[PDB]
Amino acid sequence: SYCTLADLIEQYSEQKIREVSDRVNKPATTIDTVIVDRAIADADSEIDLHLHGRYQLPLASVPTALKRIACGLAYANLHIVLKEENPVYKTAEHLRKLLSGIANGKLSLALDADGKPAPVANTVQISEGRNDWGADW
Amino acid sequence: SYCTLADLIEQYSEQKIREVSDRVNKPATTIDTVIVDRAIADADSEIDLHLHGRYQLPLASVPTALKRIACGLAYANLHIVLKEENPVYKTAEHLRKLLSGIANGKLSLALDADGKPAPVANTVQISEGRNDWGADW
Amino acid sequence: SYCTLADLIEQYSEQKIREVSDRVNKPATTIDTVIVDRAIADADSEIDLHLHGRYQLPLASVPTALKRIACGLAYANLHIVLKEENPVYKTAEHLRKLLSGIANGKLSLALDADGKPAPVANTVQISEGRNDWGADW
Amino acid sequence: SYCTLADLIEQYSEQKIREVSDRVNKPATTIDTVIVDRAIADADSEIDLHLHGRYQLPLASVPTALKRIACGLAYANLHIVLKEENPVYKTAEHLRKLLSGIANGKLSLALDADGKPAPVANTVQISEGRNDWGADW
Amino acid sequence: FLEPLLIERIRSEVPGLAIVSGVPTLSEQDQPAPSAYVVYLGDETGTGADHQGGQRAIQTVGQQWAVVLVVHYADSSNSGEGARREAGPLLGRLVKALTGWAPAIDVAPLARSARQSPATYASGYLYFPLVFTARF
C-alpha cells in the first residue's frame, strides 16, 4: 500500500476521484472504496514487478517518490478507457519510465522518512575466498 | 484461473461486461458465464505461453500483476471485432509488452500474497563437479 | 482438430458463423459443416507447418493457446475476400506472429490440461561418447 | 524542503499559486497549504531520486539551483492535468534534464551559500594497499 | 433549447460491436457493426412570416438532418434482398425515435418524415442519402 485514498484525493482532488470511481450513479455521489483499493493494488503490483530485482518486496516503509508513482498509476488505472493522447496516459508513461530507470540502476530509490531502503543481496555473492598461507601462521 | 468474473466486473464495471458478453439479447440483460470463462481461459493460455520457460505452469498462487494482465487480456478477447486504434487493443498490447519483458528476464514476477513465485530449475543445471583429491583425505 | 464448430460459435457467436458459412442462401439460414471443417483443417495444417520442427505432429492433446490460434485462423479462412485493413486479418497476423515466436523458441507451448506437450528429439542427438579407461576398472 | 510557499509565490506570483492550489472555491480565494506541501515534497522526492548516488540524502543546505529546480517541479506538480505542449511541462522537462546531467557527472552541484555540498564516498573506495618492504625499515 | 431531455433516450448505443467510433466516406468493407450512421446535410432559414417574432430577431429556424444505412448483411454484391427489406422496421424505428419523438414543444415542431425520403445506391455495396427535416 504505497498510496491511500487520502493521497489520491490530495493529488487529484476529491471531485475527480468521485467522478472516475462512481460507476453506478449518474451524476456521481460517493467514492467507491473497493474500486480505489483495486486500482492502488494494481499500481503496487506493477511497481513491485519493476522493483523486485533490486530491493526486498515487503517494504517496511514507502519512499515519497514511490508514493507519487503509485498515485499516478492508480489514477491511470481508474479509467476504463484510456486513449494514447490522454494526458493522464502520458503521466503514467513518464512514471513507468522513472520505474524502469530505477530498475536499470540509473536512479536510486530515495529516503523513506530518514533511513535508506533495503537493497537485496544480489551483488553481495562471491564464492568464499580460499587464502590459506596468508593467516599469520 | 488468474482472474474471475468478479475481477472483470470490478475492473470494467458490470454494464460493460454485460454489453460485451450478451450476444443473443439486444439490449443485453445478463452476463454469459460461458463466454467470460472462455475469454479468461484464453488469456491464461497466452500468459502461460509467455511464462512457461521461467516458472512452473500450475501456479499455486496468482500474483497481482498476473491478475491485472489476465483481466485486460480477457476483456480484449471478449470483443468479436477489435481494430488497431481501439484503446482496449492498446491496453492489451501494453500488457503483452509487460509479459514479454517478464519472459526476457527484464521484469520479475512479484509476490503473490506474501511469498515468492516458484521459478523453474532451468538455470540450476551443472554437470556434477569432479573434485577428488580435495576432500580432506 | 484443435478447434471445433462449438469453439467457433462460442468465440464469434453463431450469427457470424452462419453469415460467413452459408453461401447459397441469402439471407443465411444454416451453418455449412463442410465449409467450417475445411477451414478448421486448413488452420490446423498451417499450425502444423509452424510446429513440426519442435513437437510431434499427431498431438494427443490440444493446448488452449493452440485452440485460440486455430479458432482465429479458421475464422479468417472462412472469408472469401479478406482485405489488409480488415480487423480479422490483423488478428490472424497476430496469431501467426505468436506461432512464429513459438517456432523460433521464444515462446513455449503451454499445458494441455495438466501435463506438458511432447517435444521432438531434435536436441537430444549426440554421437555416443567414448570414455573407456573411465569405468572403474 | 528545497523550496517553500514563499519561493513559489515569488517565482510564479501569488495569484497563479492561488489559482492552481484552490480546488474547492470557484473563483479561488486562498492558497491550500497542504496541496503545496505535497507538491513540494514530491519535487524533493524526485530530486533525491536523481541525486542519491552522488551526494548525501539529508542535505544540511539547499543549493540555489536546487531551489529553482524544486520550485519548477512543484509548480508542474500542482497541475491536475498537464499536456505535452504546455510550457510549464517544457520547463519541467528542462529541469529534469538539468538533474540528469548532474547525476551523470556532467554538471556539478553548486555552492549552497558559501561552502561546497557533501559528495558521497562512492569513489573513495580502494582495497587498502599492501606495501610492506617500503616503510623505511 | 430543450431537446437533450429526450435525446438522452433517443440515443441508446445502437451498435453492440462498435465502440468509441465517433460515428456522426463510409468504409462498407470493415465496419464492425451496423451503427446508426447519422449524417448532416444543411439548414433552412427564413423571415417575414409567422416564424419571425419581435425582439431577439429570432425565427423558427428550419433544420436538416439525415442518416446513412450500413447493414451489408444478405447484400454483399448479391442483390438488394435483406438490405432495406429488413431495414424497413429499423428505418421506422430510427425515424420515430431520432425524429418525431420530442419533449413538450411550443415553438419546436421537430418535424418528422415517415415517407417521401428517396435513397439511391452507389459504390457497389450500399448508399442511402436519407432526406429528413428537423425544424429545430
TrEMBL record, chains A, B, C, D:
A Pfam match: Phage_Mu_Gp36
Domain of life, source organism: Viruses
Name by which UniProt lists this protein: DUF1320 domain-containing protein
Automatic annotation (TrEMBL), chain E:
InterPro entries: Phage_JBD30_tail_term-like
A Pfam cross-reference name: Phage_tail_terminator
Top-level taxon: Viruses
Protein name in UniProt: Uncharacterized protein
